[PDB]
Design an enzyme around this catalytic site. Sequence first.
Site, mmCIF file in Angstrom:
data_model
loop_
_atom_site.group_PDB
_atom_site.id
_atom_site.type_symbol
_atom_site.label_atom_id
_atom_site.label_comp_id
_atom_site.label_asym_id
_atom_site.label_seq_id
_atom_site.Cartn_x
_atom_site.Cartn_y
_atom_site.Cartn_z
ATOM 1 N N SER A 83 0.857 -1.214 0.000
ATOM 2 C CA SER A 83 0.000 0.000 0.000
ATOM 3 C C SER A 83 0.887 1.257 0.000
ATOM 4 O O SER A 83 1.646 1.397 -0.961
ATOM 5 C CB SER A 83 -0.993 -0.046 1.118
ATOM 6 N N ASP A 118 -9.537 -5.462 -4.343
ATOM 7 C CA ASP A 118 -9.013 -4.335 -3.547
ATOM 8 C C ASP A 118 -10.009 -3.169 -3.692
ATOM 9 O O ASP A 118 -10.264 -2.748 -4.819
ATOM 10 C CB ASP A 118 -7.607 -3.957 -4.046
ATOM 11 N N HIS A 161 -7.603 -5.422 0.385
ATOM 12 C CA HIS A 161 -6.524 -4.419 0.340
ATOM 13 C C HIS A 161 -5.359 -4.922 1.192
ATOM 14 O O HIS A 161 -5.446 -4.821 2.394
ATOM 15 C CB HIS A 161 -7.033 -3.059 0.789
#
Length: 554
Positions: free
Chosen positions: A186, A419, A465
Amino acid sequence: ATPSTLAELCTDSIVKAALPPSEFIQGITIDSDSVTTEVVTNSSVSSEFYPSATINYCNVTFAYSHDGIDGDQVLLEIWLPAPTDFQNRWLSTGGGGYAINSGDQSLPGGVMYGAASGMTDGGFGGFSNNADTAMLLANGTLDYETLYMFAYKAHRELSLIGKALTRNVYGMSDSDKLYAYYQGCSEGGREGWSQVQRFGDEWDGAIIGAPAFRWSFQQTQHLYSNVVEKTLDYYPPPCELDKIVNETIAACDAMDGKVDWVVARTDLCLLDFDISTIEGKPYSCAASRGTPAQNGTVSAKGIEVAKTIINGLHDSQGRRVYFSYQPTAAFDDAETQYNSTTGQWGLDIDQLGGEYIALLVDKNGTTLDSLDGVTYDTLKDWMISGLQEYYSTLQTTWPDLTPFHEAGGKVIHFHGDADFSIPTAASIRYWESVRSIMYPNQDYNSSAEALNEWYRLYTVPGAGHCATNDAMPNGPFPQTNMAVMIDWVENGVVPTTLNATVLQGENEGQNQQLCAWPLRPLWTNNGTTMECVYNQRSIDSWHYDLDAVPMPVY
Ligand SMILES: *[C@@H]1O[C@H](CO)[C@@H](O[C@@H]2O[C@H](CO)[C@@H](O[C@@H]3O[C@H](CO[C@H]4O[C@H](CO)[C@@H](O)[C@H](O)[C@@H]4O)[C@@H](O)[C@H](O[C@H]4O[C@H](CO)[C@@H](O)[C@H](O)[C@@H]4O[C@H]4O[C@H](CO)[C@@H](O)[C@H](O)[C@@H]4O)[C@@H]3O)[C@H](O)[C@H]2NC(C)=O)[C@H](O)[C@H]1NC(C)=O
Ligand SMILES: *[C@@H]1O[C@H](CO)[C@@H](O[C@@H]2O[C@H](CO)[C@@H](O)[C@H](O)[C@H]2NC(C)=O)[C@H](O)[C@H]1NC(C)=O
Ligand SMILES: *[C@@H]1O[C@H](CO)[C@@H](O[C@@H]2O[C@H](CO)[C@@H](O)[C@H](O)[C@H]2NC(C)=O)[C@H](O)[C@H]1NC(C)=O
Ligand SMILES: *[C@@H]1O[C@H](CO)[C@@H](O[C@@H]2O[C@H](CO)[C@@H](O)[C@H](O)[C@H]2NC(C)=O)[C@H](O)[C@H]1NC(C)=O
Ligand SMILES: *[C@@H]1O[C@H](CO)[C@@H](O[C@@H]2O[C@H](CO)[C@@H](O)[C@H](O)[C@H]2NC(C)=O)[C@H](O)[C@H]1NC(C)=O
Ligand SMILES: *[C@@H]1O[C@H](CO)[C@@H](O)[C@H](O)[C@H]1NC(C)=O
Ligand SMILES: *[C@@H]1O[C@H](CO)[C@@H](O)[C@H](O)[C@H]1NC(C)=O
Ligand SMILES: CCOCCOCCOCCO
Ligand SMILES: O=C(O)c1cc(O)c(O)c(O)c1
Ligand SMILES: [Ca+2]
Ligand SMILES: [Cl-]
Ligand SMILES: [Cl-]
Ligand code: NA
Ligand SMILES: [Zn+2]
Ligand SMILES: [Zn+2]
Ligand SMILES: [Zn+2]
Ligand SMILES: [Zn+2]
């Protein structure tokens, strides 16, 4: 001379003697007196990113400062394996959200593979203080030092200092090879790319999940669902959108050839499933603590909002500006809030999107109080203006990786198919940008093969995610990336497919393989044998023409 036990290694005297000197990087002063050392014995660790283990290490911290910056201080934390467990490895680790470190969560993943493992506080005033709290000197005035340290400078310094300390403390000779790695997801994935794009020999291998790169487009698109709801004047109850996701999973599960309540082919889903078929389906959600009971039928307006979100930001002239999350991703950006006065669901401004505008565009807060007057074209203008402003710092989409490639570096890049925070297509786009810039005079298959020698990209069926998805608990997750990267870099083992593990549910512990882009997974023989197939129609579904934007968007 070199220490042989963890107890001999883990002392202030040993670490102070192994630090590089001040001005080894011109402009960096290291505070020797700030050294802390602490033995940690029999620590049980676990993560979705590494196998479970029990580890022993030396926890080291110390401070440094940038010459000429009044009040400046950066903290590093480095975990050193016992000398008998050290395997000539360094692991850099990174952040999440506006944090540049992940606390104690990433560092174990290095120590358990015999790597000295490091993180930084970025100069933000402590590991638990983040870049957003340090970004503004005043309302309207950015702290450029914070911007540059978060963008790329802090990770450069961490690698230079940490690698030198690791060579000195274990008594490595100058010829002894130190294999250096990165692992992050991320914001952490963006941080990995920030170094690969600039510094060809900082790392031998980078492991990058769902990166928050393409900064101006990625942060601003968090407001897209909000602006769709405002523009169509309909605020779907969360339960209505959750029903659409559940029915999309039901309709698209079998398109990958395996009935497992996992959508491995969100491309076939986007191409072949019309969510208009969900209109009229009943939904019911129980009252939460803070949200009431929701029930109804999926509405035409709810489908119109959902289709508009899935179709991605287009400007007032119908030209495409960006793309959105794949079908089967949760509608998190679209989340509405219940008003008890009015009895109605209404606008709930997305925190990450609002923070980008308030902090780095307006430079006077971390929250946006209103979207009054914000249109599709306002979002386009923010994406385009931010591309120029942040190209050199946060954008992190530089596609010419000649220095890294020429040094023999390797990348494993992965992204969840479901995601809800960073569109899966954002990762395909960058790999294609690199392919076309670095191999410009070759056809698609020839250039793809050349890039796939050193930079491989894998989507993760059903994953959320940087994590497993409770909606698709049979889905796999790449839990062994450090072992795979070591095998690639150190042992010549090419990761044709990426190793993965089912971490949840009745198949917990089972192995699966992930296909390398541009191949896609297809199961045959009643869901028993997986193949990686070339399907032009699917490949084309992942490629977007951003014809609203005159500049190339890498
Ligand atoms: C790896 O190794 C690192 C490095 O050691 C370690 O990080 C450190 O963790 C410790 C423990 O969490 C942190 O220690 C705290 O530090 C704060 C700040 O200390 C400094 O600043 C103060 C003034 O703010 C100075 O006085 C002090 O000398 C230092 O300069 C301390 O304030 C904390 O003390 C309070 O809380 C403790 C609870 O943990 C109490 O035990 C303690 O008695 C204090 O309580 C109260 O004190 C006052 C009462 O009169 C009052 O102010 C409040 O009531 C307060 O509650 C504590 O010492 C340290 O900062 C970390 N260092 C860094 C660089 O991050 C990692 O945890 C380690 N990791 C692993 C996995 O091993
Ligand atoms: C850390 O774990 C190790 C391994 O379980 C512990 O060492 C064992 O301790 C038992 C009980 O004394 C012995 O019978 C075994 O011989 C030990 N095994 C080894 C490999 O040494 C050790 O005590 C633990 N240390 C702490 C601090 O908990
Ligand atoms: C934070 O900064 C933004 C931009 O500098 C301010 O937004 C402006 O506000 C005035 C009215 O208050 C408008 O006339 C301008 O059109 C706005 N400019 C933009 C680009 O939006 C906002 O007021 C500031 N907030 C605070 C609390 O100071
Ligand atoms: C959408 O699907 C999820 C499951 O994937 C449903 O959530 C489960 O529902 C049951 C009954 O309400 C709960 O006991 C489980 O805890 C839920 N599972 C998870 C993972 O949260 C959810 O209710 C479905 N939503 C709709 C609107 O039908
Ligand atoms: C690009 O390369 C792929 C192989 O990666 C070619 O895909 C194969 O196409 C042949 C002929 O259609 C099929 O028999 C194979 O089954 C395909 N392989 C796989 C793994 O699916 C593809 O045709 C090539 N494209 C071009 C233009 O030549
Ligand atoms: C910045 O503006 C905010 C919003 O009005 C105000 O609350 C705050 O005190 C001001 N200054 C800083 C740097 O916080
Ligand atoms: C709900 O609506 C009423 C006006 O109808 C408003 O006063 C109240 O602040 C609203 N609540 C929120 C949190 O917006
Ligand atoms: C303990 C399990 O081993 C599985 C295979 O590991 C592959 C080797 O990778 C390198 C790590 O030292
Ligand atoms: O680190 C994260 O979880 C993160 C960081 C971001 O800047 C972002 O836009 C996002 O959607 C996720
Ligand atoms: Ca399936
Ligand atoms: Cl080195
Ligand atoms: Cl990983
Ligand atoms: Na000590
Ligand atoms: Zn302790
Ligand atoms: Zn040696
Ligand atoms: Zn080459
Ligand atoms: Zn080749």
